[PDB]
Amino acid sequence: MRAFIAIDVSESVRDALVRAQDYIGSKEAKIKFVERENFHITLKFLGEITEEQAEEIKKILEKIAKKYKKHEVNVRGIGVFPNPNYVRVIWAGVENDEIIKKIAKEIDDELAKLGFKKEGNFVAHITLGRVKFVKDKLGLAMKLKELANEDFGSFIVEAIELKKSTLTPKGPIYETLARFELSEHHHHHH
Template sequence: MRTFLAIDLDSELHQKVIEIQKKLKETKADIKFVTPENLHFTLKFFGNIDEKQLNEISNIVKKSIEDFHEFELHLKGIGVFPNKKYIRVIWIGVDNPEYFIKLQKKLDIEFNKIGFDLERDYVPHLTIGRVKTARNKDRLIKKINELENVTVGSMKVKELSLKKSILRPEGPKYKDLQIFTLSK
């Protein structure tokens, strides 16, 4: 099964993200937007795993988060991967990434011990759209520059979700396999 570990976007912030997506839509660029129910921060993408790996991952998350507690995330700014000359992914950034990165690195090191590659240059981000073609690229870049410092809002991170990704022609569907609660 195709899986990943994530932090779901607080539903109270969905509308603000939708408003940003609408502004990007006005550029008439060829963008496939992430649906509100699929908005999340990926901590680790595992790809296809079996039941044994699922159990190992679950045990690692349970043990690793013992040292972590709930934390606040401030969502601010629009960015792109890999760069503005060749935009593939449009995302919203995190204004206070230190604790988030500390959590991700701790998990990543533990996942590496069971055979998963370490992440390089991890950047906490919320993917909001994927660019399919270069249509209206200049208009898109102009709009991204305008939104570069947009403030989205804050959310309290209380849990992590181990998710199964089901690929469908109309877009992926995510199903929670397990929820891990951070201490208060």
């Protein structure tokens, strides 16, 4: 029941991150990238939850997402950890996401009562993949510098999407729990 609310990343972005990955590849370095429809920006991590609480979180969102507006941010820049010289976890960085920052904290601050952890400092990042083993060093940096400014795109956070994650012996499972779509359903016919 690894619930977690994220922000839909229109193709503009989704495809963006992919463009960078394709250029990277796991030729020399071993990096297990994440699914395309899994690059959703984690707004607020909840983790384990009860079928009874699952409803609580929703209520809060219905209010918070109602007290906030839809700002226009941009996704650019990528950071590594623990440090460049030694990259172990690849993650992207979002531009001025103040609005998304004050919100992430507000959503948690409340969850603290329902029995959740409080995240003092919020950081909007998106893990692309973890590094297992690599032989070519230069490549790592040579790229980090290229994809360091490579613009991915921008968008506006209007509606919110709540997905769930559950790891199993057969593989990682992903199921939706809550979806707040501002615009009426059947917006565009695919």
